[PDB]
Amino acid sequence: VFLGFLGAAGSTMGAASMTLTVQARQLLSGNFDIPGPKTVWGIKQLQTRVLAIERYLKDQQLLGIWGCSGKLICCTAVPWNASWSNKSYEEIWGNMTWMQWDREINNYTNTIYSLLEESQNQQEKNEKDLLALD
Amino acid sequence: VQLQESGPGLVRPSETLSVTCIVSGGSISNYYWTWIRQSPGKGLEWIGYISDRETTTYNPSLNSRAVISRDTSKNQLSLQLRSVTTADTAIYFCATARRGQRIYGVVSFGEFFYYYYMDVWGKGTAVTVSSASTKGPSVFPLAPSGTAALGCLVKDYFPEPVTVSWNSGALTSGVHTFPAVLQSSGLYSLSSVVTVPSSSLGTQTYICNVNHKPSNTKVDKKVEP
Amino acid sequence: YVSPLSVALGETARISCGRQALGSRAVQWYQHKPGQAPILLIYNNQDRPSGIPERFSGTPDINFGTTATLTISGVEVGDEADYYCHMWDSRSGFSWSFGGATRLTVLSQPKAAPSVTLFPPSSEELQANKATLVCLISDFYPGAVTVAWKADSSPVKAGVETTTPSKQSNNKYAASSYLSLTPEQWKSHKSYSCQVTHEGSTVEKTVAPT
Amino acid sequence: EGQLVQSGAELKKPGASVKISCKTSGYRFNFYHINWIRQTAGRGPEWMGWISPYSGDKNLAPAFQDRVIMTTDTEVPVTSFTSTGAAYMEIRNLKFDDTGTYFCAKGLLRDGSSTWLPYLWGQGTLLTVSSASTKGPSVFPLAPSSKSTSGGTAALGCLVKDYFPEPVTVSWNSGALTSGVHTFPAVLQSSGLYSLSSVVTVPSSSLGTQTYICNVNHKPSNTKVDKRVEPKSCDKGLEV
Amino acid sequence: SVLTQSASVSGSLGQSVTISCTGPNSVCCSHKSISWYQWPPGRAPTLIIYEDNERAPGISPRFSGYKSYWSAYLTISDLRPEDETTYYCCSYTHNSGCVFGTGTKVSVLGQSKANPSVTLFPPSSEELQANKATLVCLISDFYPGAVTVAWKADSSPVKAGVETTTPSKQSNNKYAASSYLSLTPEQWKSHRSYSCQVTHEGSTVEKTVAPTE
Amino acid sequence: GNLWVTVYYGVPVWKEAKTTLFCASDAKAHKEEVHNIWATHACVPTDPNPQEIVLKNVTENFNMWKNDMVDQMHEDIISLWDQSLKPCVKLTPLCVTLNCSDVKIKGSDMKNCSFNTTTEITDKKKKEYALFYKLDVVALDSSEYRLINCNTSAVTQACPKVSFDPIPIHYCAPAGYAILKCNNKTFNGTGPCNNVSTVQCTHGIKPVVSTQLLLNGSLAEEEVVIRFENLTNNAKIIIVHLNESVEINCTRPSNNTRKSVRIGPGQTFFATGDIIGDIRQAHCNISRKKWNTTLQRVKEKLKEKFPNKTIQFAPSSGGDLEITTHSFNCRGEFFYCYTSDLFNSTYMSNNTGGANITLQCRIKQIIRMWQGVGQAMYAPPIAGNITCKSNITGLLLTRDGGKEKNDTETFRPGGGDMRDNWRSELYKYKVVEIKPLGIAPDKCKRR
Ligand SMILES: *[C@@H]1O[C@H](CO)[C@@H](O[C@@H]2O[C@H](CO)[C@@H](O[C@@H]3O[C@H](CO[C@H]4O[C@H](CO[C@H]5O[C@H](CO)[C@@H](O)[C@H](O)[C@@H]5O)[C@@H](O)[C@H](O[C@H]5O[C@H](CO)[C@@H](O)[C@H](O)[C@@H]5O)[C@@H]4O)[C@@H](O)[C@H](O[C@H]4O[C@H](CO)[C@@H](O)[C@H](O)[C@@H]4O[C@H]4O[C@H](CO)[C@@H](O)[C@H](O)[C@@H]4O[C@H]4O[C@H](CO)[C@@H](O)[C@H](O)[C@@H]4O)[C@@H]3O)[C@H](O)[C@H]2NC(C)=O)[C@H](O)[C@H]1NC(C)=O
Ligand SMILES: *[C@@H]1O[C@H](CO)[C@@H](O[C@@H]2O[C@H](CO)[C@@H](O[C@@H]3O[C@H](CO[C@H]4O[C@H](CO[C@H]5O[C@H](CO)[C@@H](O)[C@H](O)[C@@H]5O[C@H]5O[C@H](CO)[C@@H](O)[C@H](O)[C@@H]5O)[C@@H](O)[C@H](O[C@H]5O[C@H](CO)[C@@H](O)[C@H](O)[C@@H]5O)[C@@H]4O)[C@@H](O)[C@H](O[C@H]4O[C@H](CO)[C@@H](O)[C@H](O)[C@@H]4O[C@H]4O[C@H](CO)[C@@H](O)[C@H](O)[C@@H]4O)[C@@H]3O)[C@H](O)[C@H]2NC(C)=O)[C@H](O)[C@H]1NC(C)=O
Ligand SMILES: *[C@@H]1O[C@H](CO)[C@@H](O[C@@H]2O[C@H](CO)[C@@H](O[C@@H]3O[C@H](CO[C@H]4O[C@H](CO)[C@@H](O)[C@H](O)[C@@H]4O)[C@@H](O)[C@H](O[C@H]4O[C@H](CO)[C@@H](O)[C@H](O)[C@@H]4O)[C@@H]3O)[C@H](O)[C@H]2NC(C)=O)[C@H](O)[C@H]1NC(C)=O
Ligand SMILES: *[C@@H]1O[C@H](CO)[C@@H](O[C@@H]2O[C@H](CO)[C@@H](O[C@@H]3O[C@H](CO)[C@@H](O)[C@H](O)[C@@H]3O)[C@H](O)[C@H]2NC(C)=O)[C@H](O)[C@H]1NC(C)=O
Ligand SMILES: *[C@@H]1O[C@H](CO)[C@@H](O[C@@H]2O[C@H](CO)[C@@H](O[C@@H]3O[C@H](CO)[C@@H](O)[C@H](O)[C@@H]3O)[C@H](O)[C@H]2NC(C)=O)[C@H](O)[C@H]1NC(C)=O
Ligand SMILES: *[C@@H]1O[C@H](CO)[C@@H](O[C@@H]2O[C@H](CO)[C@@H](O[C@@H]3O[C@H](CO)[C@@H](O)[C@H](O)[C@@H]3O)[C@H](O)[C@H]2NC(C)=O)[C@H](O)[C@H]1NC(C)=O
Ligand SMILES: *[C@@H]1O[C@H](CO)[C@@H](O[C@@H]2O[C@H](CO)[C@@H](O[C@@H]3O[C@H](CO)[C@@H](O)[C@H](O)[C@@H]3O)[C@H](O)[C@H]2NC(C)=O)[C@H](O)[C@H]1NC(C)=O
Ligand SMILES: *[C@@H]1O[C@H](CO)[C@@H](O[C@@H]2O[C@H](CO)[C@@H](O)[C@H](O)[C@H]2NC(C)=O)[C@H](O)[C@H]1NC(C)=O
Ligand SMILES: *[C@@H]1O[C@H](CO)[C@@H](O[C@@H]2O[C@H](CO)[C@@H](O)[C@H](O)[C@H]2NC(C)=O)[C@H](O)[C@H]1NC(C)=O
Ligand SMILES: *[C@@H]1O[C@H](CO)[C@@H](O[C@@H]2O[C@H](CO)[C@@H](O)[C@H](O)[C@H]2NC(C)=O)[C@H](O)[C@H]1NC(C)=O
Ligand SMILES: *[C@@H]1O[C@H](CO)[C@@H](O)[C@H](O)[C@H]1NC(C)=O
Ligand SMILES: *[C@@H]1O[C@H](CO)[C@@H](O)[C@H](O)[C@H]1NC(C)=O
Ligand SMILES: *[C@@H]1O[C@H](CO)[C@@H](O)[C@H](O)[C@H]1NC(C)=O
Ligand SMILES: *[C@@H]1O[C@H](CO)[C@@H](O)[C@H](O)[C@H]1NC(C)=O
């Protein structure tokens, strides 16, 4: 189902995965502001919408330093450590929501970010480089 | 209603003028009574008024020399004016006032005012102020001489006015009392003439009654050719 | 204090008040004739008491800017009087003044011939060492009258006391002249004549001692 | 922490109706179905039916499709992921084969092939349907006996005798005594009366240092009996 | 209930035991999903297996599920003492209701048998004031669920007023029961001693009280 | 059982954060043609088709008293006043000596003053006169007066081409953010909202600055709502959303006029010229039946927070006039009315009902708006009479303190802080940021 932007925030994680592209386009452009507000308080919105570009580019670069690029859903090669969540499939995607899930990952998210990059693609691109000559 | 004024006619300066106002055709405690005067060469001047609560308010031009009172027993109104001068010689009327409240906004804010106005008036009593003294009028009969005229001449009196009647209510059509003249002696003089048919002479009696209220000179003069 | 206003007979007269109101007004109009009680014509700007003719109207108080004006439709010879505009308003407090009078003069009135009557001195006056000739003029319009005295066709200059012309009941003017003489001067000249001239009409009456 | 509490045990007359409640806590009451499952002595366990607190969609068993009505109350949000809800089941035309233990239960998952499956079960509600009047019990004290001579252990308790409604609870010292407490099941007399006994094993040396009082509560009769067991032992193996 | 299970299966401590769950072509397998429930009598059950073989959250991997074209099976590996209770199976679809089976009682043998503790209590004086007498024989802490109580009034069997309860599973993997002998005061005074004899499968525990004591 | 981490970009997850929202000038007001409105100076178009999305199964926590949209709106209004009063004519040379005298009323207060101002040239000097209401200091006590603002701060006249009419303004959420909206009708104000919408822009909110009586607000659609910040703490604001709107019609009938006096090279100062017609103060009418019904409804609703305690209310405390008056704007003139007769009820039934209920109302011309970077604004006069109708939709009340648990509880009007004025419209909105990058174990692997 479509439902709309942020519609599946109460739905299950699997059902919310269907609408990744809906909540993706709303992260970038909020329709051009025609001629600009200028004046005194225009710098407020100017910096607030430059910070949006900065955040979006930081996310895209975090994707690019992983294997995930130009794609929303993306599988990787890092095994799910049991000390995170310690729950089964379908015990997750059919019982939990994405907010409730994020609640259970923040403690260990900064390390998963490291394993997904320093150990995954920094080794994977090295292998592909060393295996594209012979 | 009917209003009739009464006064002395003559008052010496540095004294107190006093006038009375007899009312008829109603009550005196349920109305408001004001006094108006008129000096020779001046318009109607407003003296003051007295209320049903028997409270008075006077014109600040009189210099607090006026005072008004009531008398419910005799159903009459009073007016007194102290320290009179020659400028206070005037005809005094008493009139009846009726309340009208002009409202132009919220009454609770005081957006209104009272506008004094008096529907009923009287004929007014004349009062003269002079250091001189009253004098009895000398009345002379003017014998008829072909146009048929029968007159009485009041030759010298002071002060005005003088009432000239002809057989009470028996002669009213042809009566003509000319206005008085101010002679260089300070004495007024007038003439009251009537037009009587020629056939009525020799058989009818014609007297002219002369009333001078200041100095009692009630004189009836019988005119004959 | 009088404001003169001449209005032709038959048309409509508009007497404007003397003082302009500073706010919502409450104007009265009084009609005062010489020697008569003042009449209340219009009170409360337009309210008319019992008896007042419909020819008199007052401008009612509406919005602001309207001048209090007394309108007399079809004036008559009996409407010549003093007109007082008692002006009340919300921005002047107690108004003791009745305002200056506006004496109305109705013109275009048919003239009248001055009726003259001459009276010689009386017997009781002759025996009182006095003499007065009484020249009574009445029923003439307008009031411009010139009284003159002659004695055996000779103009008398001194001893003349003439009243100012004043109209009475018929709205026609009436004047009185008195010639003061002594008993020996009365029998002196043979014929005394009062000659009045009104609008050029020169009419003369004569008396003789008998 | 999805703890779910049911209503209290009741006795109703045959032909009337009864409404059992089910109050929840620890989860979003609108996320999982509520199932009703009964257990009678005759036909064993039987599934009555489930209802969705979110959509109101229900599935009733055909056997109970006539005389059972399931309803739900709107949830009262506590936090972003917990709430307090209530589900009611009203059954009419009560008979003899309907006396037993009724359970409400929380569903398993929010989407899949076995969503409504009863996962978390409540403490149960005992429902008796008979014409017999509610008769209160007569609590009697039990004299202490010897359980171990060389160790010195006394066993003393209370007897709850003669009562018609099945459920009856027994505590010790207003719940301040939980060690050694053992409550035996009731018994079915030829007259239809139930009776049970509770016993606590205490040390034989704690006769003047601790007071043992048994509190018998019987809600269908709305009765409370506080009995004091006399520490005067009578067994010959304990007096030594 | 057309979904027939196993009547009663026994097992060895530490080993495994398999329970069967089968029924007609209308209410079994192939198209339907089978679940399993550990149902302690008088207490709330527990989900252990759903969707044929998928365990419930918190369930040890000892429990296993299987489904064939005609029967499903629940395998209990590494038998524990607390695994001695009743087990039911359910046959359901996605939008249907749960169809419970007949029931299966699993007995776990190979455990240390317990000596039955038997205690006899005579009626108190408060009950004597009510013209009633009740002897209470409480049995606790025994392993085999088979006990027979005999009441002897002065070494003579008693048939009337005897009410024996069914053995229930104690919370400590043991069994307990009780027996009540109802006697009138005339029969309470006209005897010298009463005896509750619980005959165990390998012993016999007798408790004798006396009205005079 | 044997899973791998997987990245999902764009998951419906949000986090509470602060940001600077946008604004919409509605349809730009092409029909007015004037470009002197505070909002139309720099706001995006209206986007005529809104997009509100319900979020099923979502229960989000809200707190209107800790809402940053309110603080942002307050700071925007404060920094907007000064930007509107910057290129306008200042009245610093008008700080001269004034002769002054009471109104004529040849036998309500408004002074008739005269001063020696500078003419078109600075070498010459002429004398002018104007009516300066009552906002004058005695200097040393026909008596010499002084302009009130020549004491502290300075004075600048409001540009006559700028109107004080409130335009519908609604804040829009920037990219990467969204506004969650509580659709529960009878809502606490703080707590978990049972069902939540999401939007980019809020509803058309009119910046109506006022005290005690909230005007042109949004009516709660199910009964009245009494929202507290702390029902135990007496020093906290109590906002009241009414069910029905209470008509309030205010007028200044005194036909005035404006004089444009020349002071300097090319700036003309507008002053209140002589009055033409009857004189009368400002006044507001509030229907007595509707206000009595509103009072009894708010009273019955206030009996919920206090079971066995009677509730009464009295007029404001007193002293400072700005706090104890229903101050607002009306076509330019800043009416400050008295609200003693509104909360002096129970013992109020004189003349068998006041029918219309009229409240006296003064007018000022030199205001200091919450001391916003000092300064002061001179409101130019409006030639003629003035009328303005409005809808009371909300109230601001404060509870007294002391040993009051015995009998009753008092609820006097308040205000002062203009942020509560914005809280009565931003109580249902909250701004959150989207955290779109999520990671979850799934069954797949690369290579
Ligand atoms: C907030 O609430 C407050 C309070 O609720 C509101 O405040 C009110 O505001 C209004 C508007 O200004 C004020 O009205 C002025 O009222 C006066 C008086 O009102 C009355 O009095 C009349 C006469 O009464 C008395 O006299 C009679 C004898 O004649 C006597 O028997 C009686 O006992 C009493 O003593 C009543 O007739 C009148 O009743 C009627 O009219 C009402 C309005 O239509 C209607 O609602 C009633 O049902 C009833 O039908 C009422 O009781 C008004 O006179 C005044 O009108 C004038 O003044 C303005 C200038 O200010 C002028 O331009 C107008 O033309 C009008 O002037 C006329 O009347 C003068 C005599 O008074 C006359 O001299 C003028 O020439 C002019 O006349 C012509 O018109 C009259 C008819 O008016 C006609 O008869 C003549 O023949 C001639 O053609 C105002 O309307 C309220 O007083 C005030 N209330 C309070 C408590 O302050 C406020 O407005 C509210 N604000 C908001 C924003 O909502
Ligand atoms: C917000 O929170 C919400 C709550 O948490 C959350 O909702 C949860 O949503 C999910 C997904 O939306 C729900 O998911 C599933 O549950 C369905 C249950 O049922 C449907 O069945 C109901 C009961 O039906 C019985 O009773 C009816 C009478 O009431 C009878 O008419 C029926 O025939 C049926 O009867 C049976 O029993 C009788 C004996 O009593 C017997 O005689 C008879 O023969 C029969 O066996 C219906 O009430 C219900 O009706 C509603 O909804 C549908 C769809 O919207 C409408 O069309 C209907 O008109 C009606 O309004 C349903 O019909 C399961 O069916 C469903 O299973 C299928 O899909 C999943 C994948 O999602 C598969 O894994 C699964 O195997 C099933 O697959 C099969 O069906 C699909 C088609 O669905 C088919 O394509 C496929 O090939 C295969 O054949 C799934 O398990 C969940 O229940 C909700 N929870 C709660 C508590 O409500 C919501 O999502 C959240 N987010 C939001 C809102 O954004
Ligand atoms: C502040 O200012 C505002 C605006 O100026 C005022 O609001 C107006 O208030 C008046 C009176 O309160 C309203 O007038 C009324 O309109 C009602 C509705 O009217 C019509 O609709 C009905 C629908 O059935 C039709 O049948 C009817 O023919 C009309 O087309 C009327 O019902 C009211 O009538 C009452 O009086 C008449 C006259 O006697 C009776 O015949 C009726 O039966 C009835 O009893 C009344 O006429 C007006 O509509 C309001 N305008 C707006 C825009 O809202 C505030 O009142 C004012 N407040 C204060 C405190 O000053
Ligand atoms: C759906 O997901 C929720 C989590 O969002 C699952 O609930 C959780 O269940 C576990 C047990 O499986 C609970 O853990 C326990 O916590 C208690 C705390 O007192 C502790 O004592 C226990 O030893 C155990 O560790 C956890 O608290 C609970 N969380 C919540 C929020 O309820 C739920 O089981 C899932 N449902 C399924 C898979 O059907
Ligand atoms: C210039 O500013 C000073 C502020 O420092 C002004 O002084 C203050 O004027 C107010 C207004 O009257 C005084 O307040 C009042 O106090 C009286 C009792 O004394 C009370 O009845 C009133 O309700 C009001 O609260 C205030 O006391 C006074 N402060 C000082 C320190 O004098 C001053 O008036 C201004 N104008 C000048 C100096 O011309
Ligand atoms: C919208 O939000 C409000 C609160 O922010 C929700 O209302 C609160 O709802 C609960 C249960 O619906 C009410 O509780 C009950 O009060 C009654 C009367 O005292 C009592 O008998 C009950 O046992 C229960 O305690 C609570 O009073 C109410 N809050 C207030 C201030 O009245 C409301 O439910 C939400 N809207 C929806 C559609 O859920
Ligand atoms: C606006 O909100 C107020 C909140 O107080 C509403 O007030 C009350 O409204 C109810 C209707 O839901 C009135 O109740 C009923 O009372 C009458 C007797 O007066 C009875 O016959 C009905 O059966 C019903 O029970 C209630 O009286 C009224 N006042 C109070 C103090 O509670 C008002 O109705 C709302 N108006 C609109 C247009 O939504
Ligand atoms: C409405 O406001 C009241 C006042 O704070 C809330 O009451 C408190 O709620 C919190 C959160 O559950 C509890 O921890 C407190 O113990 C409550 N205190 C009192 C005195 O009630 C209430 O929860 C709010 N309700 C909603 C739906 O927002
Ligand atoms: C929250 O619940 C209320 C009550 O059901 C919803 O209110 C209605 O919303 C629909 C959809 O816009 C309108 O057509 C109705 O007119 C509303 N009625 C009332 C009485 O409010 C509200 O939309 C829900 N909001 C969310 C986000 O789910
Ligand atoms: C305020 O005072 C001024 C001056 O005292 C008033 O102006 C005088 O008004 C009269 C009549 O309108 C004029 O003849 C004078 O020439 C004016 N004086 C000056 C200096 O201009 C003014 O009228 C007063 N205000 C009001 C409303 O009456
Ligand atoms: C999970 O992470 C912890 C902490 O770094 C580590 O000790 C553990 O070995 C990890 N487990 C796996 C399966 O990698
Ligand atoms: C203005 O200046 C004149 C002298 O030119 C002076 O007489 C007058 O008093 C001054 N005005 C005031 C208000 O003092
Ligand atoms: C509410 O008031 C109480 C007592 O005054 C205080 O303890 C508490 O912190 C307050 N809560 C707030 C201000 O959020
Ligand atoms: C309420 O108003 C009346 C009438 O003006 C007044 O007498 C009374 O004192 C007022 N009450 C209060 C508490 O101010």
Residue numbers in the entry:
A (entry chain T): 518 to 547, 547A, 547B, 547C, 547D, 547E, 547F, 547G, ...
B (entry chain H): 2 to 82, 82A, 82B, 82C, 83 to 100, 100A, 100B, 100C, ...
C (entry chain L): 1 to 60, 61A, 62B, 63C, 64 to 92, 93A, 94B, 95C, ...
D (entry chain A): 1 to 240
E (entry chain E): 1 to 213
F (entry chain G): 32 to 138, 152 to 185, 188 to 309, 312 to 321, 321A, 322 to 402, 413 to 504
Q: What do the authors report?
A:
The envelope glycoprotein (Env) on HIV-1 virions mediates cell entry and is the target of broadly neutralizing antibodies (bNAbs). Soluble native-like Env trimers have emerged as a promising platform for HIV-1 vaccine design. The N terminus of heptad repeat 1 (HR1N, residues 547 to 569) was identified as a major cause of Env metastability, leading to the design of cleaved, HR1-redesigned trimers or UFO trimers with removal of the cleavage site between gp120 and gp41 (19). First, we identified tier 2 mouse NAbs that were elicited by a 60-meric I3-01 NP presenting 20 HR1-redesigned BG505 trimers.
As expected, Du172.17 gp140.664.R4 adopted a protomer structure similar to BG505 SOSIP.664 (79), B41 SOSIP.664 (88), and 16055 NFL.664 (31) with a Cα RMSD of 0.6 Å. Nevertheless, a large conformational change in HR1N was observed between Du172.17 and BG505.
